[PDB]
């Protein structure tokens, strides 16, 4: 990874070795080690770009709202001064009646994403390790290994199915025929992977019907 680094530093690297040495007891081919590294780099790049986009849009909002407020805090006063030496207040108050909830909503996400993108690499490690290993094991091994890895990092909160997918995509997947279990939704999250080919062990054909339902659009 140090040659996949330029192309805290040692704690990441020694964490990789310990994860792999613990995962040798289920079949650990070095092809899976390299698949792990490539999907780590890919997911970390896509999420850094999307978080910088979100902070850019929130920064533009915090700029434009403050600029319009600074403009509206003196325009009626300038008109009143011109009337004193010698029609936008209603629409300004109507805009403030929505902005009292809108700016209050769009405030906090700047500091939220600011504190979030210091905790992206360990999240990408967990999200890559789950995809590159545990789409085979039974769910007790999923629970035990995710708990051991989560205690290994030290952030005993911070789940991953909300980290990697949001509610709208889940209900759209549910709108088609995907089973609503934890297992089915995590399995449909693992076929995000495109480094390799997915292999669907499937006794009853619902998941296959779902996949060839929502792959209708392309050829």
């Amino acid at each position: 990874p140090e040659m996949l680094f330029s192309e805290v530093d040692p704690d990441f690297l020694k964490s990789f070795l310990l994860i792999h040495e613990s995962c040798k007891a289920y079949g650990a081919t070095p092809s899976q080690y390299m698949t792990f590294l490539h999907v780590y780099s890919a997911i970390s790049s896509s999420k850094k770009k999307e978080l910088l986009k979100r902070q850019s849009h929130l920064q533009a909002g915090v700029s434009k709202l403050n600029e319009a407020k600074a403009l509206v805090d003196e325009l009626n006063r300038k008109a009143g001064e011109q009337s004193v030496l010698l029609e936008t207040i209603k629409a300004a108050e109507v805009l403030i009646n929505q902005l009292d909830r809108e700016h209050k909503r769009w405030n906090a996400q700047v500091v939220e994403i600011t504190e979030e993108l210091a905790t992206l690499p360990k999240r990408a490690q967990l999200a890559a390790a789950f995809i590159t290993y545990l789409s085979a094991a039974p769910e007790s091994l999923r629970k035990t290994c995710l708990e051991e890895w989560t205690k290994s990092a030290g952030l005993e909160k911070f789940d991953l199915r909300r980290f990697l997918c949001t509610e709208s995509e889940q209900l759209i997947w549910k709108s088609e025929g995907l089973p609503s279990d934890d297992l089915s939704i995590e399995n449909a999250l693992v076929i995000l992977q495109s480094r390799v080919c997915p292999f669907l062990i499937d006794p009853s054909s619902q998941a296959t019907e779902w996949l060839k339902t929502h792959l209708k659009d392309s050829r």
């Binding site: 079949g27 092809s31 700029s63 403009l71 325009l75 769009w106 297992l183 062990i201 054909s205 996949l211």
Partner: protein
């Protein structure tokens, strides 16, 4: 030159960049060697405990009364459509903030933003009232079946491990749900419902036991009986 070709048997074929390959499987074993499994990532759709519980719970709700089923369907579908439309209405908040970043106090885009935020607040309060008006209305009409579905989810995982002493003791799930249909369709039990739940678990254990001892070998029925009793009531033999 600029493209790439890939070998398929004898032909030489251009590898188009839009190539995506998926493939399905109907049996967890067959077949991987340890050479074609380090390149292919394997996904196992499986029926587990917490999913099967909810499946049988929904079947019992649909077979108790159809009105509660239609209500819990329509309310959830309307709640999902309202959530998607609420995300769509709040998806114009970036446009109302920085669509052009100029003359925001001048043009009527800030006027249309007031109407959009009014619609958003109306849908948000309506969804709060709806999520209050479905919770206890679904809990008291849905929670009258789960002590059936709990032990009905126990019995399948009891009878799953019967193959590991004698082969051809392999049991499906489609016929199991056919049995769970037969438990309703032959019952016709008119009582208290809380007096009906023990009646239906009682008249389901008989049909399960008879359906499995149709299949078994004559030196195995005592095995099946004792493992079944250990499966249903694990409290009557205590510890060590």
């Amino acid at each position: 030159g600029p493209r790439y070709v890939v070998q398929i048997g004898d032909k030489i074929i251009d590898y188009n960049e839009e190539f995506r390959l998926f493939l399905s499987t109907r049996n967890p074993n067959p077949f991987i060697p340890p050479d074609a499994a380090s390149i292919v990532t394997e996904v196992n759709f499986t029926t587990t405990r917490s999913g099967l519980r909810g499946q049988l719970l929904a079947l019992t709700i649909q077979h108790e009364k159809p009105d509660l089923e239609e209500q819990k369907t329509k309310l959830l579908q309307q709640e999902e459509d309202k959530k998607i439309q609420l995300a769509k209405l709040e998806e114009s908040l970036l446009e109302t903030l920085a669509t052009s970043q100029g003359n925001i106090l001048e043009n009527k885009d800030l006027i249309e933003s007031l109407n959009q935020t009014k619609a958003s607040s109306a849908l948000i309060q309506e969804s709060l009232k709806e999520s209050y008006k479905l919770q206890i209305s679904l809990d008291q009409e849905r929670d009258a079946y789960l002590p059936l579905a709990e032990s009905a989810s126990k019995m399948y995982f009891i009878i799953s491990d019967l193959s590991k002493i004698n082969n051809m003791y392999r049991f499906s799930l489609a016929a199991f749900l056919r049995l769970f249909q037969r438990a309703l369709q032959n019952k016709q039990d008119s009582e208290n419902t809380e007096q009906r739940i023990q009646s239906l678990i009682s008249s389901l254990q008989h049909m399960v036991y008879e359906y499995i001892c149709r299949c078994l070998f004559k030196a195995d029925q005592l095995m099946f009986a004792l493992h079944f009793v250990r499966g249903m009531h694990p409290e009557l033999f205590q510890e060590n």
